[PDB]
Paper text:
The [name]-48 carbapenemase is widely disseminated in Enterobacterales, necessitating new treatments for producer strains. [name]-48 is a class D SBL that uses a nucleophilic serine (Ser70) to hydrolyse β-lactams, with a proximal post-translationally carbamylated lysine (Lys73) proposed to act as the general base for both the acylation and deacylation steps of the reaction.
Nacubactam is distinguished from avibactam by an extended C2 substituent bearing a 1-aminoethoxy group. Both [name]-163 and [name]-405 have four amino acid deletions within the β5–β6 loop, including of residue Arg214. In the carbamoyl-enzyme complexes with [name]-405 and [name]-163, both nacubactam and avibactam adopt similar binding modes to those observed with [name]-48. These are characterised by complementary electrostatic interactions between the DBO sulfate group and Arg250 ([name]-48 numbering) and positioning of their C2 tail groups close to the β5–β6 loop. The C2 substituent of avibactam is identically positioned in all three enzyme complexes, whereas the additional 1-aminoethoxy group of nacubactam appears more variably located across these structures. Lys73 is fully decarbamylated in all DBO-bound structures except the [name]-405 : avibactam (both chains), [name]-163 : avibactam (only in chain A) and 16 hour [name]-163 : nacubactam (both chains) complexes, where Lys73 is modelled as partially carbamylated, in dual-occupancy with a free lysine side-chain that is associated with either a water molecule or chloride ion. A hydroxylamine desulfated carbamoyl-enzyme was also modelled in dual occupancy with the intact avibactam- and nacubactam-derived complexes of both [name]-163 and [name]-405. The desulfated hydroxylamine group can form hydrogen bond networks with the active sites of [name]-163 and [name]-405 via a water molecule, observed in a similar position to an equivalent water in structures of the uncomplexed enzymes, that is in dual occupancy with the intact carbamoyl-enzyme sulfate group.
Author numbering:
A (entry chain B), B (entry chain A): 21 to 261
Write the structure that this text describes.
Amino acid sequence: GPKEWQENKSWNAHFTEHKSQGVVVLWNENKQQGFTNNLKRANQAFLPASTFKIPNSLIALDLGVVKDEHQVFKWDGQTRDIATWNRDHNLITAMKYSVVPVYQEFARQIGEARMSKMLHAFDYGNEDISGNVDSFWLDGGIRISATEQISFLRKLYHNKLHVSERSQRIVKQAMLTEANGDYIIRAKTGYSPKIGWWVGWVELDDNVWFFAMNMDMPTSDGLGLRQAITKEVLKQEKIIP
Amino acid sequence: GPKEWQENKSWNAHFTEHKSQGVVVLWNENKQQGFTNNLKRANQAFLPASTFKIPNSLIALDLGVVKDEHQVFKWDGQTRDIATWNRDHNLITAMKYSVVPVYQEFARQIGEARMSKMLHAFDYGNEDISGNVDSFWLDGGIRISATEQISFLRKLYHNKLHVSERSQRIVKQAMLTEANGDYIIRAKTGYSPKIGWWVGWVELDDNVWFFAMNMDMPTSDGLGLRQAITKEVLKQEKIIP
Ligand SMILES: *C(=O)N1C[C@H](NOS(=O)(=O)O)CC[C@H]1C(N)=O
Ligand SMILES: *C(=O)N1C[C@H](NOS(=O)(=O)O)CC[C@H]1C(N)=O
Ligand SMILES: [Cl-]
């Protein structure tokens, strides 16, 4: 019989081009088949870092901590290193600019008990929120693999997570990254010390390709390699032009 | 003091450059003010043509004629002149490829009584469905002006139409045309005998600009001028780069 999961090591060339190492995992929804350059690393669990703003957003919306995608979270007046964080935001722009202080406030309002219960309900990674309620996804005990990211994203795509359909549609809107006549990408980046992520999916006319990539990220320089390397894989596989 | 609507006739140069005539209407949501090159034509009511697939989609979803954006409507097997129509479609691809026969099926299932009631609820144009329920927006009596399109789109953007929030969110998803780090465009084209349309909005980080344009279209050549002329106005006004 055909293989649910196949390894394509030729994608390693896209990492080697940049003196980097990592994994891209692709899932072809119509075929129900997955593809990766590194089967072992595809299943190793890492801190989710800013990719956690996907479940954090869902939980905040479903609990009413965030009323809708237009509600304004005012800047607290603390001048931070990332200039785009030093302004008022809504859910859309907080996702777009990956505004940590806004999501820390969401997490504090959610609280430890509800956050833990909701990650259990989501089957999210190791479901472990050990650490600070407002930083465990950056320096605490939570861990998720690339294949687990795809599983979670597939549930989100199909409105199957244990939150309202409305919360799922709002977050999928907030994940919008790029759209043209050839494809739509909904995705979220992340970076914790050691590891950069890009997770999401590519919508085509007649199929959807889910993706989850992580790579060794010693420096914030080359954060753009997350999208660049993934797009080289997508181009090689003729998913995007 | 300032007016709700201001005329900017310098935009006429974008029509003149293409030996064409028409109107662009913009609405700045933050400032609650509108701008147009021709206030008279901005209020002239025309057949909506394929821009009707916005309200038609909303009504079909809210009545359950269309269950969700993934439900497939199979090709009826009749080979029509637009090749992309000769295939199966869902709501997303039917709006992208402007598949009239799919929307005619929606309209027949909606039926005349519910169609008329819903367009009245929407305050949509002249609300006149006289003719056939599956062609009145192509060759019947319904008429809508560019400013009426703006009013309708503003209600849709704010989830204020008399249909479920869910139906409104799905249609706004289906309207997605272009997205990048600078802007998102949700919009729909149309073409009836001698008139081309483009209506929708441009989402920015801290504002939304609604737009409705129409132009004289004596031949099918120059349909791309609908977006091209609109984008020249958007660029002149520094809404997009
Ligand atoms: C999340 O991983 N973070 C917040 C912010 N996002 O940048 S990224 O999404 O482009 O990775 C900066 C990196 C990281 C953090 N340092 O908290
Ligand atoms: C809608 O106005 N129509 C359907 C189709 N779409 O073309 S457009 O959306 O690019 O204007 C062809 C034109 C028109 C029609 N002939 O019914
Ligand atoms: Cl969207």
